[PDB]
Copies of this chain bind each other. A is one copy, B any other.
Amino acid sequence: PQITLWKRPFVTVKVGGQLKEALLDTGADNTIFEDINLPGRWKPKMVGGIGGFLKVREYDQVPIEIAGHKVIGTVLVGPTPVNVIGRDTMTQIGATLNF
């Protein structure tokens, strides 16, 4: 797709085969969801945002699909106010910013 930015750029995303929504966020290094339930053990991880630093759960090698693109990546789960697709995943799907 080619999408403009008048509204928040949410996409449908299948993450661990569960159907969710998340914001394509070129300012996010990492991809983070609030309450998807991914199976298994996870690694503690820290992420930083406008307000400070949060402790999140890092789940490795998680399947993610966006726009027909099926990728394997790292997905954080933590108290983010909105689900975000970060640059890690966006480079895997060949996403670019254009103007």
Using a CB–CB distance below 8 Å, which chain A residues touch chain B? 1-6, 8-9, 23-29, 32, 47-54, 66-67, 69, 80-82, 84, 87, 90-91, 93-99
With beta carbons under 8 angstroms apart, the residue of B2, B66, B90 that contacts A96 is B2
Whether the Cβ atoms of A50 and B96 lie closer than 8 Å is no
Residues of B within 8 A of A96 (CB): 2-5, 97-99
In Å, the complex CA distance between A38 and B60 comes to: 43
In Å, the complex CA distance between A99 and B80 comes to: 24
In Å, the complex CA distance between A6 and B87 comes to: 7
Q: A4-B91, A48-B81 are in contact. Are A9 and B54 (CB under 8 A)?
A: no
Nearest CB on B from A33, distance (A): 13
**8 cross-chain CB contacts under 8 A:** A3-B98, A4-B91, A6-B91, A27-B28, A49-B50, A50-B52, A95-B98, A96-B97
